[PDB]
Amino acid sequence: KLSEEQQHIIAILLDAHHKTYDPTYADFRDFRPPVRMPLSMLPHLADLVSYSIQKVIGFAKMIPGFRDLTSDDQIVLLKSSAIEVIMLRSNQSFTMDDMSWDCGSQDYKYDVTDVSKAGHTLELIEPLIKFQVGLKKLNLHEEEHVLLMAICIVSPDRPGVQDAKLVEAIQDRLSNTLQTYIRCRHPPPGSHQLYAKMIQKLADLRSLNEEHSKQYRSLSFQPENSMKLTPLVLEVFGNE
């Protein structure tokens, strides 16, 4: 009932998360300031996103086996799940109180109007908010949370992956660790179909990613806006 190895994997991911999920506002002060009135929030959010991508990479690098992949598979996996993992990890600062990502101050409090002020419409926002709420409603354990992020990143079906077989063996160990964790530690009836609901969330992330990309390609197609991005965001999300 949950090998020492599986407990080990979980300990690793919880650690990786505590080390990579550490917003301090001191780090937030270093971003372009949030200009709330269009695209007035694009500079600030571009920096938050850019900062976050680094966190995800640090987290990813901590996933058992991830380091055993060629640089291209890792690369492919990261620029493929970056936005997804970020929307995922952000659920920690998201608050039901008022449907926003509150990171302390009113300055670092982001709501629907802020996201649209960064270039998005409800095309992305509606399903995004729905994702955050649904995520809260699942009331996941931190253990489940960290496993879902690792599984999101090391996904065999991401177009562009070369050695899906090794990516698969990795994801499988993680999936099994998750399922076993849910059966043995998550309280019933809350554990019923939990794994399935977590997979569905990952499916919703794929959709959100597509929606991001549609708008992103559009926006990045406009130089005056594209010049307000960071080199890393351009490198990971794409450029022409």
């Binding site: 990479i57 640090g58 690098k61 890792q74 690369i75 620029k79 890393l232 490198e235 990971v236």
Partner: peptide, 10 residues
Amino acid sequence: NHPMLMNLLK
């Protein structure tokens, strides 16, 4: 190529 990403993976 992905210079920064590669570097970050180090």
